Amino acid sequence: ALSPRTLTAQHLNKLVSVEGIVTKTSLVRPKLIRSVHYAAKTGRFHYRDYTDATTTLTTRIPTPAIYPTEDTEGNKLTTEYGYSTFIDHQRITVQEMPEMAPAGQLPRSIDVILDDDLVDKTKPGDRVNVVGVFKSLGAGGMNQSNSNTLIGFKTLILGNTVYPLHARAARQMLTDFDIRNINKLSKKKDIFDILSQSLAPSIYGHDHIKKAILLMLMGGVEKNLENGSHLRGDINILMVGDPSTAKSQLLRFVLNTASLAIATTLTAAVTTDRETGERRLEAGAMVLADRGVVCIDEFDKMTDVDRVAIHEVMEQQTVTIAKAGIHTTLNARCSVIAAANPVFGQYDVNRDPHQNIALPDSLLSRFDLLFVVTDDINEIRDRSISEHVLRT
Amino acid sequence: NDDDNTEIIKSFKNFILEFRLDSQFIYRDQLRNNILVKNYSLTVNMEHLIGYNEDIYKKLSDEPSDIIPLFETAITQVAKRISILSRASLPTFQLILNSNANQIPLRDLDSEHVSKIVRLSGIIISTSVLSSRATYLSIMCRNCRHTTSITINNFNVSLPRSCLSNCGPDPYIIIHESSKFIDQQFLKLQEIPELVPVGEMPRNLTMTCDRYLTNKVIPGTRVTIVGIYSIYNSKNGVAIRTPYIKILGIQSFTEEEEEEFLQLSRNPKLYEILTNSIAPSIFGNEDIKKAIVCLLMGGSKKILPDGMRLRGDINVLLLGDPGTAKSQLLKFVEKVSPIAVYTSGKGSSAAGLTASVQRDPMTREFYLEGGAMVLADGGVVCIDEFDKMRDEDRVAIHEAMEQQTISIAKAGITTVLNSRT
Amino acid sequence: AALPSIQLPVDYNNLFNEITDFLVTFKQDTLSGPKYMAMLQKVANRELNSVIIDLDDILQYQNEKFLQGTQADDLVSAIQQNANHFTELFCRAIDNNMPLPTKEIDYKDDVLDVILNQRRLRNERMLSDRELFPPNLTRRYFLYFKPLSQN
DNA sequence: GGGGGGGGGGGGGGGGGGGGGTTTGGGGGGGGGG
DNA sequence: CCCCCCCCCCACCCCCCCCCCCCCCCCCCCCCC
Ligand SMILES: Nc1ncnc2c1ncn2[C@@H]1O[C@H](COP(=O)(O)OP(=O)(O)NP(=O)(O)O)[C@@H](O)[C@H]1O
Ligand SMILES: [Mg+2]
Ligand SMILES: [Zn+2]
């Protein structure tokens, strides 16, 4: 039981478990392992199997990626896709958990190789435990091209299983007990208080904020009028105020209560990266939250090209693309809750949100509800939260 | 000459088995005790090798790259003889050298020291990730599957050019299952700053270590190195060669400082004593010195049942008039704090603060390298004249100062680093 | 470089015969010459180049044969499994069976006609004791398989 | 006295072996805010 | 009007090729008819 740090050359060719975090997931590629060929005149189906340092746990002579095209008798061969066998192949770089990395050291990392049904078991950032065989491969500079032989051998884990560590319900099951108690509760009058106050029970006060949050979670109905003329039913909220107030903690409670909820701290874009010789259309949180919700902390920090396009989310519940010939429009039909801080100093309750924060009034006005919260210096609140922090 | 090598080996075996001072066989004891705790190395003081038989030291120092493997071999044979009943398997033991030869400062090492044993000192400014070097290669011919092997001594081999009895031009391959490997690590040593010549830029050496010398140092540590000043033909003048050192030894709680610190803890006047001991030439500023002691000690770092983790590190800002000894206090804290980094605000860049991309000249491939915050992890970063720092740098301070992390996505390398500072 | 070989549950001779049988027989009879041979007369007139095969037509033909009590060896599965090879088989069947043109074309205006006619003349000069071409050269149409509908 | 056959030189073909094939910092220009 | 910001620009297999060797052809010389 190891991590990418304590994984050591003594462990080579042993079966190991590595605790870590996924980074640099490669694209999935099909790897040829058996090629099948009809022989044009001979009638027989010839074939060839293939080998490399990753497809086998033990060393065997590599078979170098060439399709044969002629029989022993010289007759030409036609390669048979479908009958030929390809396995999915993917590389993932497991990083050491930064909590484990000691003082003054960077986190080590290693490349896991995954085939077929272990492919895409994880995505970048997933905390994971992988089990596989730790291996060396390649010539390590022992081949006579390399004048420099101080370079070490490449090493890998050939994966045998991938356990995502999600723990240290997106649609829930419903029992008859749930059906009964939901309906029995719904006939009571104080449900709008009790359910909303069940949100964020550690938070002092802020009843109206919790009620407004519940109305956003149970948001309004869409209106497609005649000719399909669309008017938006979704609700949008913004919590302006001081830092150290309930805001960010309320966003945690909302994020863990809602479903199809996206965490941010936008719109859609046409994008490119180091290895891509190509441009791809990317989804921001509102597109990802289509008919869901977005949680936007530190919303005062968002840059101009984002804020200019937020109007399309707020008015049309959509976002439009306008470069690389991908002129199109995407569904972004979400209900948003955002939070923001003063750009300088504590919040001046005399000044407007437009004045305490750089966001324009012509943007701030889009939100259905616009709260301003502040760190009231109340002794009862301070006594309570203080003793909670001390017990912590 | 194999008989001569055998007599060298037997000479070293006799040195292990016979060397004795004040009734103790120190190297038999050290080798046995090292075997018990399962570290297969031996630390040899060359004063003792000289004192035993200076002919052996002369052979060693004339050509260490040939003699050191023979000494290692002798250590293996004695290890078996003192820990296994033979006629009723251990690896190749690492040799480690202690020395008091006169140091050559890192700038004076030049072509006359090539392949000599050298003693020097400096500051370790970088420590690469571990890497695997072969000791025993199991080797196979691609055509006839004639198998052979290479046993390697890592002091400077290649695959054989053609089959050792058509068989193809360049046929051999490695059997990675039966081959044996060791850990190798690269370090960069910079010369001691108070030894740099006037107006010079400080010079540095790349150097290597393996087995039980890996992970033994961290960046910023001041060390004395014993190693072979040596050469390799890098890919990047004409007939030129890259110098490097193959390390053979490093020097950088004890059971009585345990008692000393118990006694000092028991002293009732301790806080006044430490307060006086911070920047003792600086008069006054008593409460500020008291706060510096608090910052040095830190609070207590904590973990909750949720996995959530709470800051132990204290941050202190000294804002005030000119000539109030602020910079003097920071430049003292960089001395006393066991891990510390000193920067100045106008000397900074966001990269050199959090972390930066590099391309290693040795592999010729990318790797990420830590900035001032990472190098201060576990201690204090002293940011002098902080008011002069650019806005983007002060933004980059936020994560490393409050979240105590640095999140990275550069050159395709996604990574997150720790910054307990 | 010697190769091993294995037996497999298919025969391209049998399937080539099945493909040409389908081509010279089938029509969309539920809507009441063959659809494909008529379309190939349009190809022969140089009025069409996009030859489309419906997998639904193949399925209807298979069901007609199975209804008439003979197994059609499920050509739909074969083309859905190793599609690329069956482009070659379908094109060879068409090249073996396409009828001659009806509409006039001014046939000599195509360089391929002149050059292959000249090669034929030269080959007859040889053949007095004193393939003609690779078929893709002469093949003017483009062949595509069109998928199954929901069923 | 011319044509065939023997012997030697010169050229061409064929085979075998070998080598090659993005981040960070700095200055200056250009534009926007106090 | 002046200064600061921010933007730009720049640093292992397969083919071609060459070298080596062997055979075949063509010319010259000598003999035979
Ligand atoms: N209280 C003091 N006791 C002794 N020496 C002092 C004291 N205050 C200042 N000095 C001396 O004055 C100098 C203080 O320099 P420095 O540490 O740079 O002050 P500072 O607070 O950093 N001022 P500045 O760099 O302009 O922000 C040193 O040479 C000290 O020796
Ligand atoms: Mg100062
Ligand atoms: Zn061989």
What's the Cα-to-Cα distance from A219 to each of A68, A263, A336, A386, rounded to whole Å? 63, 19, 10, 35
Distance (Å, rounded) from C-alpha B172 to C-alpha B141?
4
CA-to-CA distance for A299 and A286, rounded, in angstroms? 14
Name residues 7-26 of chain C within 8 A of A (Cβ). 7-8, 12
Question: Whole-angstrom Cα distance, residue A337 to residue A335?
Answer: 7
Q: How far is CA C92 from CA A174, B115, B249, C49, C73, in A?
A: 61, 74, 77, 16, 20
Do A63 and A48 meet the contact criterion of CB atoms below 8 Å apart? yes
Round to whole Å and give the CA distance between A221 and A218: 9
AA identity, residue B44 = V
Cβ–Cβ under 8 Å, residues A200 and A253:
yes
* AA letter at A197: Q
Neighbours of C111 (CB within 10 A): 8
Unique residue bearing structure tokens 């400077």: B156
Interface contact flag, A68 C3, Cβ < 8 Å: yes
DSSP assigned state of A152:
P
As a whole number of angstroms, the distance between CA B64 and CA B206 comes to 19
Kindly state the helix (H) or strand (E) to which residue B352 belongs, with its residue range: helix B350-353
Please enumerate, as own/partner, the contacts of A171-178 that have beta carbons within 8 Å and a separation of 24 or more.
A171/A259
Closest among C6, C7, C15, C8 to C88, alpha carbons compared: C15
Q: What residues have CB less than 8 Å from A373, skipping those under 6 apart?
A: A206, A209, A239, A240, A241, A242, A245, A246, A247
CB-nearest to A106 from B182, B309, B417 is B417
Determine contact, residues B152/B137, Cβ cutoff 8 Å.
Answer: yes
Please answer whether residues B331 and B382 qualify as being in contact, where contact means their C-beta atoms are separated by less than 8 angstroms: yes
Which residue bears the tokens 């095969």?
A: C53
Which residues sit directly before a break in chain B (C to N > 2.5 Å)?
88, 156, 165, 236, 252
Burial class (CB in 10 A: 0-12, 13-18, 19+), C142: exposed
| DSSP per position, B46-103 | HHHHHHH-HHHHHHHHH-HHHHHHHHHHHHHHHHHHTT--TT----PPEEEEE--PPP
3-state secondary structure of A322: coil
- Asked if the Cβ–Cβ distance from B174 to A23 is below 8 Å, we say no
Angstrom distance (rounded) from CA A173 to CA A20: 32
Burial class (CB in 10 A: 0-12, 13-18, 19+), B50: middle
Residue C6: its chain A contacts at CB < 8 A?
Answer: 36, 45, 47
A338-376 b/e with 16+ CB inside 10 Å = b?
bbbbbeeeebeeeeebeebbebeeebbeebbbebbbeee
Chains with 3 or more CB pairs closer than 8 angstroms to C?
A
The Å distance, Cα A56 to ligand 2 centre, comes to 63
Sign of CA dihedral B253, B254, B255, B261: negative
Q: Kindly determine whether the C-beta of residue A66 is less than 7 Å away from any atom of nucleic acid strand E.
A: yes
SS3 category, B381: strand
Q: Measured between alpha carbons, how far is C20 from C93 in angstroms, rounded to an integer?
A: 6
Please state the atom number of ligand 1 nearest to the C-alpha of residue B326: 21
Counts for chain A of helices (H) and strands (E), in that order: 9, 18
Ligand 1 atom closest to Cα of residue B384: 22
| E strands present in C34-147 | 50-54, 142-146
Q: Do chains C and B touch (3 or more CB pairs under 8 A)?
A: no
User: Distance between CA B418 and CA B309 in Å, rounded?
Assistant: 13
Which 3 state secondary structure label does DSSP give A46?
A: strand
In this structure, are residues A319 and A330 in contact, taking their beta carbons and an 8 Å threshold?
Answer: yes
DSSP classification of residue A70: B
Q: Cα separation of B66 and B63, whole Å?
A: 6
Query: Is B93 within 8 Å of B41 (Cβ atoms)?
Result: yes
User: What radius of gyration, in Å, describes the C-alpha atoms of chain A?
Assistant: 29
Q: Which two tokens stand for residue A58?
A: 């033990």
Q: Who's near C72: CB < 8 A, 6+ residues apart?
A: C18, C61, C62, C65, C66
C-beta separation of A313 from A334 below 8 A? yes
| Ligand 3 ion: Cβ-proximal residues, 5 Å cutoff | B 141, 143-144, 146, 163, 167
d(CA A163, CA A19): 10
| Number of other residues whose CB lies within 10 A of the CB of residue B60 | 23
The letter for the amino acid at A29 is R
3-class SS at A359?
coil
Q: Smallest Cα–Cα separation from B143: which of B119, B166, B117?
A: B166
Query: What three-state secondary structure class fits B154?
Result: coil
Q: How far is CA C121 from CA A217, C106, C128, in A?
A: 84, 20, 11
- B351: nearest nucleotide, CA–C1' criterion: D24
Is B327 within any annotated ligand binding site?
Answer: yes
- The SS3 call for residue A282 is strand
CA atoms within 13 A on the CB side of B253: 8
How far is the first Cα of chain A from the last one, in angstroms, to the nearest whole number? 32
**Resolution to one decimal, Å:** 3.2
Among B47, B39, B38, B40, smallest CA distance to B19 is for B47
| For chain A, the helix, strand and coil percentages under 3-state DSSP, each to the nearest 5 | 25, 30, 45
Residue A174 exposure: Cα atoms within 13 Å on the Cβ side = 8
* From B129, B132, B232, residue closest to A148, measured CB to CB: B232
Angle between helices B326-336 and B286-297 (to 10 degrees): 30
For residue C82, which phi and psi values (nearest 5 degrees)? Answer: -135, 55
| Cα–Cα distance for residue pair A391/A385, rounded to 1 Å | 10
Instruction: State the Cα–Cα distance between residues A327 and A344, nearest whole angstrom.
Output: 39
